[model samples]
Target: ECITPEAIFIGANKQTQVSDIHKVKKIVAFGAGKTIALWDPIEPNNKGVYATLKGHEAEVTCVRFVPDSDFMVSASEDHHVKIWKFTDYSHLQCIQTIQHYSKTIVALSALPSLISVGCADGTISIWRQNIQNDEFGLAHEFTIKKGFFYPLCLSLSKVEEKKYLLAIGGTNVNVFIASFILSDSGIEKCRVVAELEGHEDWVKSLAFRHQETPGDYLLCSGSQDRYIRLWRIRINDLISNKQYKFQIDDELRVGINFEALIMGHDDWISSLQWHESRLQLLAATADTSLMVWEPDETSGIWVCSLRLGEGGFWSCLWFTHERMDFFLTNGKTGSWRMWATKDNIICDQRLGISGATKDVTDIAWSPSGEYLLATSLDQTTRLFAPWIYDASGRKREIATWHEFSRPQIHGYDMICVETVTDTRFVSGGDEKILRSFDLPKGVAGMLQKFVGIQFLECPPMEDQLQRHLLWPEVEKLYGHGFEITCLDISPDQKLIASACRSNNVQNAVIRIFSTENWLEIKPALPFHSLTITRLKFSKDGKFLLSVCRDRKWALWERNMEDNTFELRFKNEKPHTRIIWDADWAPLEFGNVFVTASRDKTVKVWRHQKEPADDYVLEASIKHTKAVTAISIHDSMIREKILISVGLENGEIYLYSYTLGKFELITQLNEDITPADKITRLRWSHLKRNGKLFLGVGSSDLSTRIYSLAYE
Candidate 1:
């Protein structure tokens, strides 16, 4: 069986500056967790991040692409600035790592032969490309003044023939400027000489450039207090209300002049991009707006020409692909929204990563695998499905997964989710209750139009999303003593086995409920002495299993006579450490189960007639790190048993079980896997093109789905 990467679902790291979501000619790169994710927007069938570059040891804070070069730069909380040169869109090589910071790197800016690395610890290091080796090396380092620590945003541009300008925006109410010169030999000394003041708060982004006006160099800073301050640097000239004079040398001198302060955004500004050649400015803000500002010819003051978007776009970028112009934005939902220029009409067909902004706590697939549900600590539970694009000619219908609906938006963390039916699901959160919701007709119609996925046939299709897109909660199942820890619905869709936080056997008991009435089925089954970490029912609904923190995995057999379950076997020590996850094997495998534990092993056990333990160890899948999650397909769709396992360090592996052997199928590569601890793994009951689907949830704030054994 071959393992293939079907889809990668991850949240883009929240962008703070304009360059955070930087792009070159062919690839769109952004910081996802600790790695840099690469997206190719032109691939119609796969409009998602195809791969990621890994090297950083901490969360990536900023990323930039060097203009007019093949070089790209990324800096992180790990304090290393890495330079990457890619010969192909799929092949990226990290050429250098500048170790110039003692704290987190917060800002990065790049020009043709220069790069700026700004740190949270008040230092900004400049790297220059030397003519001799053509490699980037450290050139100069400067510090932000005492009270104004950390350069929140930085800009680099060529002000004149041989002179370069670096604008630094920091904590205080001022924009700092530095001057540097690239002589015939290479980059020379760089020093900060003046600070321009007009903004009253910290800046989040800075964009400076020279337009058609010969001597006018415009600098704009989007600040923390909802204002965009404009400044101009002219050759011995320029204007505003306040002007600060600065000198470089003999012939060439400049004026640091404060221009008009544009006020329109209701909240803090996040990014600013200057299309100076077009004489327009694009600003993205935390208040959910994208504003294009242009200078009014008569007034000589910048005014908002067009405003668009909602739900807080952190950054906006102009991307020209295949001679088609587009506007890209990363929004509050962790996905990149694309606005295309269809000549005059700007139509948006959202693409790119729709990742969980925080750790994904659980992932549940629908009974028929029609859709997938994901829950995250970022306070969201979203629905995802493959959108079938029916291509009329040339090729076959293309399909790619997308986040179709966000059913849960919480003030408290989203904890768990379970699909009971194709149209209904149950969710749990810190509220200590389970919410049962249903996808309505309005949503079904929207999906048919947007994704071409028909949950059911309808008469009409609409381009507009329903007024209230959220699913309506039809029932609230409340019984757990604390917040829910795990949930599993029966194969027959008749019962739900659930558990929650517990310190003793009383609260640790597993509660079984009827799906019809949502009432407790019988007496609570108590086995584990602590919180139950996972619950599973066998394929035929003949047995139920609960694995818990007590380092035990318990089994119960359902007696058809009373339609009730009785305790069968409870292993006191399934492994050397806590049992984190468990799943029943396919019915054809006959009375077998798998348990993953913190002991770094996944134990495969078989039921036998032996009286002592009643179960014998079949195979032990060993790992160097703790195995935190495991899943076995209930019914094999491809004539092979597929077992999925997730580890403490965010690694997911596939294994197949034979008579007495466990064959390693594949360990998901670094590019498609999460960067932190894996929390949950669920296998779909069905297959697509002979490949089984596995959903993975991780503490690294990502949810992933892998299609296994697909040719």
Candidate 2:
């Protein structure tokens, strides 16, 4: 294959340090905790963490590979700097633990026999390591004393045969470059080489490139200024020279090696590393990605290569001698990803809105994966594909979709949206019209069902506008005079049941429909009193569950023997107000059902052994606000993560059942409009990564999608 660099997503845990890796022979990552991990990327799909470097008591924030690749050095937030052997990732010894900084060691660099460390205390330390019995004894250590303030990261360059130059990056974009010669007299005093300023934020990393036509070496630094800064260094004998470039502005001004700003990045620059052979530089930021910039062979200017991760880098390193291959970083997420130059090693965006409603309330995937659908309170239902991968590799809306509606389903204003199947769907609203529709061409039927009209398929954007449809509605069915709150389709797409009721009303009705002729199979049955809120059909199509504002849920079974339906389990739990939505667990537990309500919680229940009026409580999901919608995507990896939408906040919460309790996976708190409330939530088919594609709806009348990452 042609020489190409591939970036593969390695780790996406916490704060990723390294990014846009070139060649990755090995991966050494550290977190805010004391331990460091080393991995051989060539191992099989996450064979598990391979080795650990122990020394620092707090978190190890930075790791550097020694020039020879035989050993690696790490600096920690615990005020300790240590070395480890790359051969087996074994701990060599603590080189030095400088207690001068009350906080921690943040950055480090390793040279022939010298080590440089940067600290939060506005200082940098240079040390000579003594290796004996696999342990290091610091022979000498010196802290920078001049114009340095709040040194957070460091870089070093070779000024001469035995002399080294160090640069410190800190607050206000301050840079102090100094040269120190090491001799038999312990260590020579440090002398100022150059000072760099002009950044509004802290500088995070620094690197250098040897200029072929050089009177001065070229340098590049990553900073919080949101731009990478470049500098030209004229290094002679550490003695002052006539060619010393002066800073005309607040920043570096002398013949700048090359300066250019990289745009399109949305967050702060977090880390950076230089590739020697390829003349490329990799940068990381708080935006959860790593980007690479390489010098153009023709123009001699730097350009961005690629960005890695959905988050930021935590740590990174060069794993090869040529410096052609490297690894970017991610913090605590526990994934150690590696990518290499396609030619050298070989390796591999943002999320958008694709919700259930204008504010998507709830989404669910059928156990069979034949289809997926979502339900909303505006009384609309939609069906779509499992995942929508946008052009930018972000999650987006799927192409095909189906809609539904109800006539007289609620009271006077009927509403309907989500759907139940390939040939059929269910709808309900103010009109108490819980009904079903079937079209001549299956997919096209969705357009004809809602407005009592049929729609002619328009072009792409035409479908998006939904206005180009020649016809808006096809057929409307009427059952009771009350509002149809919620409904579900049978697993076989053969039957659809809907619940209809209103406040202070008694004898709510359950309506069933046959898809063949849009005919009602059963007369509306008086199921319960009070406005009905939720309805669900089990995976097997044998059981049905419904909850109402009366604070009670009724479970009924399909009566194949006759037309009469019998209530098998009745839950008359007393509550202060109405129940919002209900769901059936997967087919795994034949009788499991779940319900969400205005009581700021969800309750799980199972049928009693004898099949009577009583039901046994299984579990409850607690929330801070009223839970409006709940959905279970059986196709997801974690069995199912119950999705709940807040009635007042428009916040979406993901929950999982574990060790007898429901734990919150994450809370999606994106600020919607001032009047928008979270009305619903839905889950798509299990994504390829074992995640669930969650769709959210808001009162703003818009919908968006979020992919749930599970452990």
Candidate 3:
């Protein structure tokens, strides 16, 4: 039988952020200031997160992994850099940070022993690290002042013994080359070697290369100028005398100031990286094109080696390893592509090439050279192995693409995937799940999972989803007068609830089904007075949470003593942002919930214990754009926290509760697609095993599940 993805969890009428993939040992994403999430990319049924890292003051910007350490660095617009240790992601330790830069931290990079930080103020600060007693200590610090008002990127290079060269490029198009000579005292005055000028626009990237000749380093740079330039440093052995540091010998065979430009890209170049001892150069542009350049064997100039993809490559990398001839890139649609190529740069098309698709934004090859990982705007990350070919006619893809399971299981598009525990996972995406495929034997013991969709009502016929389960096709549930706005399955596995748009109809239908009799539950309500936009069942599986098109949401619960249902709680204006989706906690129970809305906000709610449990608005997040979906963790590491995904900008917000209030902890990019509208979203099942995974669906015509398998 063909494989059909199985449901782990499902929600209706909710704006969920299942994208936002981060590649720090799996995927780590945060949203709405409270919820922190993790995802895996191998198994397809796990849900939830690996750990939750909270304690941020405002919104989060840049985050990165510290070299040779277990902690991560997060920079915020709040003008602070936080160093945190994620030993047991559920809880964390804020190591240390710097508060000198009073602006946003735009760029972050590290070296063998130092950290390079770039700020929106065009300032670059260098900090030394000392790890002793499991805590981080700053050994020393320095900042290079260039002539420009604002610098873009910063890089540190070693020209001689303990003598480091700092390269800064940015606004006004200039390159600041500062040489810092280190002594027993500390970093002495940095001599301004050269303030080179050539670029007509901003510099996008800077790379230093060591030529075949010893002690001879060349600076290879890429810029918005759509050109790549190489500058040579003629050592002249005269530096041994110190008197010739500023003079050009008339009898010299070569000059110290030399420059050459290479052109192939036709748009603003985004990034540049090298392959094989800098033998070949790879560049990416906004138009999604990747070009490979190789220096001519005899001619000292470089030429176009090849081009990959016809559209949308935001970034590219030429990784190093055996049989790892692959180029990874991404685009505005949140989709990513990896190309497998031949050894010969000029090989003909007859040689053939293949690739794979992923909803991603940024990609990085590990410094260890053992793996290639990518981060998605969709709230997940993925790891892949290059497909290798053998002499015996066995060919392998440059990499075996793996993703987290979807949380919803069925909404529609599969944009995210991950593998968590040996035998469990979770996922999310458009229409959630498709069908279930038996676990591939060796794939057992995986932790976590990852992943959406719509319609057709013909008597709850035998369910195509439960066929392979412990049950058989029984019946179907139907109602929605205009469009089925939302739906959910009871935790008891015996009931189904549905909500529909009423158009001008005075009453909207609320239908309930009995899994055993394949019949409607006695006494259904034709209660809602307007188009129902969202519907969710409480954690106890007794009450229903409903939101209307006019910005109202109410709680409905069954009166056990009378065998009837009662309206419990209702909010006058449940959402300040156009309400898109609402989610009830499966693990927390009661009226505690989360919501996503068009006002670009995600919120948490706490209902009182009294009748109608008056909701105490918990946390409300103002995001970069409107929120599309929300999903709460079913299994518990955390209770009452939720995630919100953005519709217009693909940003994800996390929320958590403490002392009766909700607070946003983090925000990251998810669903990097440039589409103006989002169609559907939901979370996976509650019985989901391993690391918690969530699922999402998109109008982009694909379903995806996300989990915290590898986190």
Candidate 4:
């Protein structure tokens, strides 16, 4: 694969560092307290994490492989650096630890024979191995004499015959250049070569790249100044010309000019790197943009080639050693994303204004199976159209999307979103108001106006201009006094049900509303004291199901005689932990529904009317982590049913049910799962030629649509 059109997410837990071994074709990432994971990207269907290095107290801040060696080194805020034999990733073992004397180590870079560590106190230490004993010893130490500042980042050049160069940047916007030389004193004291200054604020990251020309090196720095600067230095000039690049025997000098200044990021530049194989430079900013720049061969000027949409910018790495178009990036959401620069889709762009920076909380596929709606802690509801059937009824993968009405006015994290119709949807979260909105009418009206004319799919920018027309707010349903936890709309589109977290009896009630009058129905049902995790209405509209944080799944059935709701079945301790989600099967499934729980299992419950009216557990599917989401689809032609279950670790499992037997169809690999739980999955109701597809949303701040095909 040259480029991944869609992002492949990995690790739901917060990540501190991401790196790769180009020679070994292995990528390693770790964080969230302290843990390291490895992945093999070549595996077609199994790109998930296969191994882990798991021993650290505080958060790990840095990791790198000792160049041309099997040993990998990691530094943590625990004031320690560890050396590990990681060639056999599955059998990773720490070989040694270097104590930082109570100081937090933040940066690390290694060469074949030398290792450089930067500490939070602006202390830089260099260690080298004794050729005979094979033991590492401190070669030299560079301590800031005056003001204390952090050496938040470091970059090192390859060691040739025990001679190397190092660059350090951090709290001080200045870049420090130092060179190490082997001498009679067992690696003579390191000498500062130069101090380059330009940035207005603190420097956050630095990277070094060896230029193809002799004695020339490129150093790029990212800083809180919201700018990136690249400097080109000729070492031979610093050594030969005292005037042009002057430095005393032990004193540093200010010399050299920056080659270029990059200006695009609107926030602090958090990370920067040079892809050696591709000879390209990549920079990331706190605003969540990944900017790729390539040098013009003739002019030697670096021009911005691409700007990956919002929702990234923590760390990034090129995946392969060779010149191929694949790279990975991670951000606050904790999911690492793999992407390709080039694309076949013309005018490709991220659908919304800004993607979710926080966890994606909920997703619902439109009843017509043409679009999707998602909510996130970013306080926005997104509308996505995964695929559209053209005039000939052949599926055209448009992959078009946009944001729902977004004057968000709710001013709270949007947690739950549900579509009552293609044009109308409801969303609620961390607020007392349940707001409803109508989709933009401009696009539909435009299409209607072009009914008899030829209309080709326009570029994203033009399409965006057309879609920019505002969507109107339909109504705001207000009754709950606390944050709304979950919401669901009935199949017939006449009733809406919402649940909220409450400590008292009045606000804990499930508020039902009639869509016709937009008024709350009388006699609200008082239920659980804790928040409800999920709410669902049965396919036939005769029952409503709600699973609560209190480990109870309660069933409310509508009384045909009085047309009022009654709590009929309440199952406590449903799975030991909180039930996160529940979904009802089609009417043909005969009173069967599924519930997912924090207990790591998906339970199938069958409602029986003959034997004293009970919901019986018929089957259970076990998982490695807590179950968070579930969706089911039954074939209209046969007795086969497809079940998709999501877990806390961002894993999704697909099971096929036939003749009362459930068999595994596929498990969405870990590498593609967001670093958070898979929040929601919907099996597309509009199937194409018996083929199945799923719309997935996760806490990693991504929404995806995938077609399932198994051999």
- Top lDDT hit: 1
Candidate 1 C-alpha lDDT tens digits along 135-224: 787777878766658888888878777788899987877788888887754556477868887677887889887647788868888888
Off by over 4 Å in 2: 1-25, 44-46, 86-101, 131-148, 210-216, 236-261, 307-311, 316-327, 331-711
CA RMSD per model (angstroms):
3.4, 14.2, 13.9, 7.8
C-alpha lDDT of candidate 2 relative to the true structure? 0.53
TM per candidate comes to 0.91, 0.43, 0.51, 0.69
Residue 72 of model 3 has an lDDT of: 62
lDDT of each: 0.75, 0.53, 0.48, 0.66
lDDT of 1: 0.75
Model 1 lDDT, residue 213, Cα: 79
Q: What is the overall TM-score of model 4 with all chains considered together?
A: 0.69
Q: Is candidate 2 or candidate 4 better by lDDT?
A: 4
Write candidate 3's Cα lDDT for 550-669 as tens digits. Answer: 777778886645335677667877677457777776454545777777777767787766665487786665666777666665544444444435465433444555535655644433
Candidate 4 ranges beyond 4 A from true positions? 1-148, 158-162, 181-201, 205-209, 216-232, 236-355, 387-411, 442-471, 505-507, 559-563, 572-575, 620-624, 634-638, 657-675, 704-706
lDDT of 4 by residue, 1-711 (tens): 011213222233332244544345455544433445555544432234444455565556777777677777877778888877754544467777887547788778777767888887768888887777546777788875548776777888743454667888877868877876765435764777677878888778888886576666678888888888888766435532222253433433324567788874568886776765567787777777777888876897888777765644677665542334555566554444555534212223321122444567788876766556666675556554432344444544533222322324223787888888766788887778888877555545433222211123321221243236445678988754677888888878988898877856553668888888898877788875578888889887898998888788888998645446999898886688888888888777678888888988888888778877899888887788998888887343245677888888767777876534678876755444445578887876766433555777776556655665432
Candidate 3 stretches greater than 4 Å from native: 1-78, 82-94, 131-148, 184-186, 236-256, 345-533, 536-711
